[PDB]
Design a binder for this molecule. Structure first.
Ligand SMILES: Nc1ncnc2c1ncn2[C@@H]1O[C@H](COP(=O)(O)OP(=O)(O)O)[C@@H](O)[C@H]1O
Lengths: 185, 60
């Protein structure tokens, strides 16, 4: 919403925020190499696509398409101090015991909606490969339905027979108070 | 006789005009049908083209 104002389009309402969310879900992708992608978009106009708001009024966006999700890898674009998702993944790995991180390097599982951009698995693998030692096999696992992985796994879990003793019954709550939840389960 | 001759001649010509209008609106209907099917086809083709071009992008 903030980066689209430099082309003239101004979305300020909450409804317009929903419109911009739809634009993001339809036109944005992750660039494998950000710098030369930027130079390419500057040179030609083959990256420009068009979107039609729900009153006519087509809008055309250029390098915004990949500048929007690039923030995941350079969170300094929005004034945050953290590191990109590739770097926090690598740090979380390197915070684990040296014997399991070879098997962690090869089972990076992606989940949730924000991991649905075209080309995010390739960029992620490139970055982690550049960070990790040159002997490990980096494998990014990105299922085609990863937007509902949490719900699917939750149904699998709640269906297990060995899980039917892990519920928090009403009686346990009546005994222990709301603090039952984290104190035991 | 001028009154009644203008009357019935203009009336039958008005009938011909309304039939021409019905023909014109049916032409509008068929043209609109062609337009809608063709634009839907164009939409499908364009979205598939975009999928395939980005697939070549990732592949290469
Ligand atoms: N195809 C897509 N491409 C890019 N982003 C998407 C896509 N689909 C959803 N999103 C983003 O994912 C978010 C919703 O994802 P979701 O996993 O449902 O989050 P939550 O689990 O918190 O509800 C939205 O903010 C939207 O911007």
């Amino acid at each position: 919403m903030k980066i689209l104002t430099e082309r003239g389009y101004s979305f300020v309402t909450t409804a317009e925020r929903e419109i911009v969310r739809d634009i993001k879900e339809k036109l944005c992708y992750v660039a494998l190499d950000f710098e030369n992608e930027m130079a390419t978009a500057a040179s030609s106009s083959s990256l420009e696509k068009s979107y039609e708001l729900p009153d006519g009024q087509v809008i055309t966006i250029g390098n915004e398409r990949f500048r929007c999700p690039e923030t995941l890898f350079q969170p300094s674009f929005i004034g945050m101090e953290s590191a990109g998702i590739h770097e926090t993944t690598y740090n979380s790995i390197m915070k684990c015991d040296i014997d399991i991180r070879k098997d962690l390097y090869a089972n990076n599982v992606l989940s949730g909606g924000t991991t649905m951009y075209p080309g995010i698995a390739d960029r992620m693998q490139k970055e982690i490969t550049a960070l990790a030692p040159s002997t490990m096999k980096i494998k990014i696992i990105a299922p085609p339905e990863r937007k509902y992985s949490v719900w699917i796994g939750g149904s699998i879990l709640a269906s297990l027979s060995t899980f039917q003793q892990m519920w928090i019954s009403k009686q346990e709550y009546d005994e222990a108070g709301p603090s039952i939840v984290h104190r035991k389960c | 006789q001028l009154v009644e001759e203008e009357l019935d001649r203009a009336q039958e010509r008005l009938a011909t005009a309304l039939q021409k209008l019905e023909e014109a609106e049916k032409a509008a209907d068929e043209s609109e049908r062609g337009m809608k099917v063709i634009e839907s086809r164009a939409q499908k083709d364009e979205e598939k083209m975009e999928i395939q071009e980005i697939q070549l992008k990732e592949a290469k």
